Amino acid sequence: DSIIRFSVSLQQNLLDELDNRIIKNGYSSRSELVRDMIREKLVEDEDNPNDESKIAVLVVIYDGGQRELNQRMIDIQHASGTHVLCTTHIHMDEHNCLETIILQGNSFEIQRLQLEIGGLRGVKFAKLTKAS
Amino acid sequence: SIIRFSVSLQQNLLDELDNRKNGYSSRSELVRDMIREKLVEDNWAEDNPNDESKIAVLVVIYDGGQRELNQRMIDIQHASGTHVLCTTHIHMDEHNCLETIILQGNSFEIQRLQLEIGGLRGVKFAKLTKASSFEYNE
Numbered sequence: 001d002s003i004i005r006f007s008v009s010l011q012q013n014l015l016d017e018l019d020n021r022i023i024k025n026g027y028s029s030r031s032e033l034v035r036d037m038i039r040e041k042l043v044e045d046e047d048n049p050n051d052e053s054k055i056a057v058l059v060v061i062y063d064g065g066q067r068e069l070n071q072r073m074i075d076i077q078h079a080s081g082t083h084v085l086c087t088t089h090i091h092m093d094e095h096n097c098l099e100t101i102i103l104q105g106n107s108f109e110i111q112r113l114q115l116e117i118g119g120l121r122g123v124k125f126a127k128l129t130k131a132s
Numbered sequence: 133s134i135i136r137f138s139v140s141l142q143q144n145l146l147d148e149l150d151n152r153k154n155g156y157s158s159r160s161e162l163v164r165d166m167i168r169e170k171l172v173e174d175n176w177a178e179d180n181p182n183d184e185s186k187i188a189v190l191v192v193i194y195d196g197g198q199r200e201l202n203q204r205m206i207d208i209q210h211a212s213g214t215h216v217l218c219t220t221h222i223h224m225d226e227h228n229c230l231e232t233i234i235l236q237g238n239s240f241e242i243q244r245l246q247l248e249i250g251g252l253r254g255v256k257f258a259k260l261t262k263a264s265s266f267e268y269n270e
Contacts, residue, residue, distance in 0.1 A: 001143040008163050009136045013270030017171050025174070031140045034163065037170045038141070042148055049155035055224065057232055059189045059261040061268050088220045090234060092187055096268045100189060100232040102222055111155045124268040125168065127261045129191045131230075 008034065049107030055085075056110050056130035057102055058117065064097040066122030073123075076116045077101070081109040096124065139163070168267070175264040179239035184215070185265065188235045188242050192249060193257035196229035201254045208252075212245045213237060228256070 010018065018030060027033040062069055077084055082105030092098045103110070110130060118126035149159060156162045179186065194201060209216060214237035221231050235242050243260065250258035 003140055004143050004146050005138045005140050006146065006159060007136050008139055008160050008167075009134050010164060010167065011270075012133045012135060013266055014164070014168060014171070015135050015137075016270070017175075017264075017266040018167060021171055021174055024178075030137055034139045034167065035141050035145070037166055038145065038149055038163065041166045041170070046153055048153060055193075055230060057189070057191045057230075057261075059232075059263075061187075061263060085222055086220065088218060088232070088234075090218050092217075092268075098187065098189075098234060098263075100220055100234065102220065102230060102232065107155055115157055115161070124270075125263070129259050129261055131193055131257055 047107075049111065051106045051108075052132070053104055053106060054110065054130050054132050055102070055104045056128060057100060058114055059125075059127045059129070060099045060101065060117060061092070061096055061124040062099070062120075063095055063122040063124070064091065065095060069120065069122045072120055073117055076113060076120075077103075080113040080116075081105060082113055172262050172264045172267070175266065176239040176243075176262055181238065181240070183239070184237050186235075186237060186239045186242060187263045189261040190231075190233040190235055190242075190246055190249070191257070191259045191261065192231045192233065192255065193224070193228060194231070194252075195227045195254040195256075196223065197227055198254040201252060204252055205249055208248045209233075209245060212248075213241045214245055 022030060022033050082103045085102045087099060087101045089097055089099045114126050114128040117123060152162060214235050216233060217236055218234040223229050246258055246260045249255055
C-alpha cells in the first residue's frame with residue numbers, strides 16, 4: 001500500500017500530445033497527469049462481458065496507403081464471430097480513411113474485434129460504441 | 133514508434149485499476165485507451181470557435197417508424213453549421229433503426245448537434261465518437 005510503479009506504452013503521437021497537455025494544464029510530470037486521469041476515469045460513465053447479442057459501431061481511422069491493412073481488418077472481422085451488418089469508407093484527407101463498421105455480437109466478440117483492429121499497424125484508432 | 137514510461141501511484145489506486153470487472157486485456161491497454169480519451173476531450177475543450185476542422189461520428193438509434201422525426205433531425209443538422217460527410221442507415225426492427233453520421237465542423241457545433249438530436253422524442257440513443265488531429269496527422 002505504498003508507492004508502486006508500472007509501465008505504460010504509447011505511440012509517439014499520443015506521448016507528444018500527453019507531454020503537451022502536461023505543460024498546458026500545469027502538471028509537473030507524465031506520472032502525475034496519468035495518475036489524475038485514472039482517478040477520474042474510475043468514477044465516471046463497470047460492465048461485465050456477457051453472451052447477450054448487442055448492436056455496435058466501430059469507428060476506425062487508418063492509413064489508406066498501408067498495403068494489406070484492409071485485408072487484415074477483414075481477416076479479423078471474419079474470425080471475430082461478430083456479424084458485420086455493413087461497412088462504410090470515406091477519405092478524410094490525402095492519407096487517412098475513416099471507416100464505420102456496424103455489427104452485432106456478444107461482449108467478448110466485439111471487445112476482441114476492437115482490440116485486434118486497434119493494434120494493427122496503420123490504424124490510427126478503433127473506437128467502439130455499443131448499445132444492446 | 134512505441135515509447136514506454138513509468139507511472140507512479142499508490143497500491144490502493146492500482147488495485148481499483150487492476151480489477152479491469154470489465155473485459156480488458158491489460159493495464160497498459162486500458163491506461164492507454166484512457167489517455168487517448170482524456171487527451172481528445174481536452175483537445176475538443178479548447179477548440180477555436182473559428183475551427184471547422186473537427187471530425188466526428190454521431191451514432192443514433194431512433195424510431196424509424198415515427199413520422200417527422202427524420203425531417204426534424206435533418207432540420208437540426210441543416211441549422212447546425214456542421215457538415216455531414218456521409219450518413220449510413222440500417223434497419224433494426226419496427227421501432228428501431230441505427231444511423232452513423234460522419235461529421236465535420238467546430239467541436240461545439242458538433243456537440244450541440246448531438247445534444248439537440250438526443251432530446252428529440254423517438255431518439256433512444258445518441259453518442260459521439262470524437263477524433264483529434266494529433267491522432268491521425270500522426
